[PDB]
Design a protein around this ligand. Structure first.
Ligand SMILES: CCC(=O)SCCNC(=O)CCNC(=O)[C@H](O)C(C)(C)COP(=O)(O)OP(=O)(O)OC[C@H]1O[C@@H](n2cnc3c(N)ncnc32)[C@H](O)[C@@H]1OP(=O)(O)O
Ligand SMILES: [Cl-]
Ligand SMILES: [Zn+2]
Lengths: 276, 28
């Protein structure tokens, strides 16, 4: 059954089984239209599709654009087939996905890189339109060909940018995978150290940091703990701003600015969808 | 809103609304 997929110019090994129909799942390899995400049985069928397919980017509204990097907001009710295909594609790299078919309650934020043939998929995150638990990300994926290049952190940052604009505090949906956890820890460390590096006051509450960053209070405390920056001396809880962490962060900040792997909030053109 | 964790083998409970003092190195 499905061990690889042909996706644009890439050949990708799958990590997990995804519930594609038996007709397709029986085959060793699937051929995907990189723009509309239709899955097909062969290279020749794919070629015939590519000759006819009108799509050169995701559906929905392009809400972020900085040069060749875009994010498209796709409504699972308005573009059901696309979003189902995206969820089946995603499950090939997720140990567990809570959802495939019933995509209507979700928004999908699809990040692309443009070149002269169109806007190519980098990754995405899904988000419930109405989350009872205030989750700002349901699932998140960077396509394998793009992994470990900074795009995952861009996606995470973007999810918190939406939350800030919504005047909400956000958290990723539990449970978090190994790679999910590492990524979020890295982002939270970056955000917290930036806040403390820019902050000049003598004391700070977790709530204030949460208000600025849109990061959940629990995730901030968890990060302070992870960096061993929560201390106890003379009956009081202190935030210990470590020298090595601040200095190491500025060196990383230099390399972050050296490349262009950052989301620029001035390149967001968004109001929360359909009033809601 | 309170969170519990252990620092140096001691269990603590911390408020998310109270101002927390920020320190650089400073002996302690
Ligand atoms: C909300 C609930 C969920 O969605 S949990 C499921 C999360 N999604 C998955 O597990 C799907 C498969 N994995 C992925 O899509 C990616 O690994 C995700 C989690 C999106 C990260 O994307 P990616 O573009 O690689 O992130 P990034 O380059 O910005 O790096 C972020 C930090 O993570 C690290 N990292 C990444 N991959 C690894 C790896 N295999 N092994 C060790 N470390 C890894 C990066 O080094 C980076 O950390 P740092 O800044 O260098 O400290
Ligand atoms: Cl408690
Ligand atoms: Zn197509």
């Amino acid at each position: 059954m499905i061990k690889t997929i042909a996706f644009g110019r890439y050949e990708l090994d799958t990590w997990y089984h995804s519930p594609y129909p038996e007709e397709y799942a029986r085959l060793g390899r699937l051929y995907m239209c990189e723009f509309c995400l239709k899955y097909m049985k062969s290279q020749t069928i794919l070629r015939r599709h590519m000759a006819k397919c009108v799509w050169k980017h995701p559906p929905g509204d392009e809400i972020y654009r900085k040069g060749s990097i875009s994010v498209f907001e796709v409504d699972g009710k308005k573009n059901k087939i696309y979003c189902q295909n995206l969820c089946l594609l995603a499950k090939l790299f997720l140990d567990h996905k809570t959802l495939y078919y019933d995509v209507e309650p979700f928004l999908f934020y699809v990040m692309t890189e443009a070149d002269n043939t169109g806007c190519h998929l980098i990754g995405y995150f899904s988000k419930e339109k109405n989350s009872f638990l205030n989750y700002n990300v349901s699932c998140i994926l960077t396509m394998p060909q793009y992994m470990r290049q900074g795009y995952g952190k861009m996606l995470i940052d973007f999810s918190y940018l939406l939350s800030k604009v919504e005047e909400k505090v956000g958290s990723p949906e539990r449970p978090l995978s190994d790679l999910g956890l590492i990524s979020y820890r890295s982002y939270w460390k970056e955000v917290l150290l930036r806040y403390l590096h820019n902050f000049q006051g003598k004391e700070i509450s977790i709530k204030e940091i949460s208000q600025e960053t849109a990061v959940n209070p629990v995730d901030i405390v968890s990060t302070l703990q992870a960096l061993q920056m929560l201390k106890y001396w003379k009956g009081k809880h202190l935030v210990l701003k470590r020298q090595d962490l601040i200095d190491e962060w500025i060196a990383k900040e230099a390399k972050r600015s050296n490349s262009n792997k950052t989301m620029d909030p001035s390149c967001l053109k968004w109001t929360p969808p359909k009033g809601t | 809103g309170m969170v519990e964790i252990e620092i140096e083998g001691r269990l603590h409970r911390i408020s998310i609304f109270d101002p927390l003092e920020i320190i650089l190195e400073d002996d302690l």
